[PDB]
Paper text:
The cellular role of DNPH1 is to remove hydroxymethyl deoxyuridine monophosphate (hmdUMP) from the nucleotide pool. Hydrolysis generates deoxyribose monophosphate (dRP) and hydroxymethyl uracil (hmU) products. Glycosidic bond cleavage is driven by a conserved catalytic triad and proceeds via a two-step mechanism involving formation and subsequent disruption of a covalent glycosyl-enzyme intermediate.
In the first, an inactivating E104Q mutation permits binding of the intact substrate without cleavage. The six protein chains found in the asymmetric unit present as two full biologically active homodimers and two half homodimers; corresponding partners to the latter are defined by crystallographic symmetry. All copies are bound to substrate and are remarkably similar to each other (RMSD between Cα atom pairs = 0.128–0.406 Å), although there is some disorder for amino acids ~60–70, which form a loop across the top of the active site binding pocket. The core catalytic triad, consisting of Y24, D80 and E104Q, sits below the plane of the substrate deoxyribose sugar, poised for nucleophilic attack at the anomeric carbon. The base, which is held in plane by hydrophobic interactions from I29 and I76 side chains, adopts an anti conformation, with chi torsion angles (defined by O4′-C1′-N1-C2) of −178.9°, or 174.5 to 179.6°. The phosphate group is strongly coordinated by S98 and S128′, the latter being donated by the helical extension (amino acids 128′–133′) from the adjacent subunit. The same extension additionally positions the substrate hydroxymethyl group through a backbone amide interaction. At the other end of the substrate, the inactivating E104Q mutation introduces an amine group that forms an additional hydrogen bond with D80, pulling both catalytic residues away from the sugar. An additional interaction is observed between a base carbonyl oxygen (O2) and the sidechain of H56, which sits on the helical element immediately upstream of the shielding loop.
Residue numbers in the entry:
A (entry chain A): 18 to 68, 71 to 162
B (entry chain B): 19 to 161
Amino acid sequence: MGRPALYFCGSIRGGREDRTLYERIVSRLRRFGTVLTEHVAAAELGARGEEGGDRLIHEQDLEWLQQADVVVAEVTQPSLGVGYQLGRAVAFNKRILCLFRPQSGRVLSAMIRGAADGSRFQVWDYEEGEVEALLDRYFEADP
Amino acid sequence: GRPALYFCGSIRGGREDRTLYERIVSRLRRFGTVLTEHVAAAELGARGEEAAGGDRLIHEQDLEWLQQADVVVAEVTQPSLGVGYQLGRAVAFNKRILCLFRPQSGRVLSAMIRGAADGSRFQVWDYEEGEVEALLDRYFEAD
Ligand SMILES: O=c1[nH]c(=O)n([C@H]2C[C@H](O)[C@@H](COP(=O)(O)O)O2)cc1CO
Ligand SMILES: O=c1[nH]c(=O)n([C@H]2C[C@H](O)[C@@H](COP(=O)(O)O)O2)cc1CO
């Protein structure tokens, strides 16, 4: 193995607008580790949980979060679950990268933007076309 | 002294439910001090144009209040990264937590919030707008 465990977060029931970007992010993360949460980018997944109970979703996810070496979150779409994941991840002292798209026209949550602290919690603005180059930079410097 | 109460509600995730946040915060004052009462301000927008100095100040002040809180109450109908983040940090602090969700919104509540419920220290209650005060009364007779 020897692969870093990568834990990806992205809105599901908060909205699936950014699913194609999640796919691109997951695809590139695979270059630098094993993505525990590839399901978040699945095209079939809907925003009404139509594809086990939520308790199982929560418990399995928290198990993966505690395995993770790095947490990567696309935080452009407001999502309770993505925020919740990042909260638990901070409490676990996980290394965290958050990716936000200003082109969305939104202003990113101050609880995420304001959580940026040192190298362990970073928040990067990006345009859709540079997502792979930014993930390379991030993981080439801090694998 | 008086219980310290920590209310969570979407700001930059959208202010659609602001009137309900005002009703929740107002009723919560019957049971203690609402540390995060600013979340209910009617004039508050979703773009952070009201505060200067950066989001780091908001994150740090909030976490200070969260650590002071005796009870956490979150209205989780509007998807919000910040509300989710607050609940994640609060779960890590093992805070007593009540979330209130409105199924009449047409949304399906995040599995990370719904699935975080253990029926005791983390409770998630469905409600309709008219009864929010009655439910807060029902929760704080015991809390
Ligand atoms: O079915 C699910 N499976 C799942 O793993 N999640 C996790 C992974 C995502 O990063 C995050 C999305 O939360 P939300 O659905 O509130 O937008 O929660 C969320 C859901 C539905 O909330
Ligand atoms: O200016 C702010 N002040 C503030 O206290 N918050 C906290 C309290 C709210 O319960 C929660 C709302 O998060 P959000 O803005 O991402 O929807 O975060 C959030 C913001 C803006 O994100």
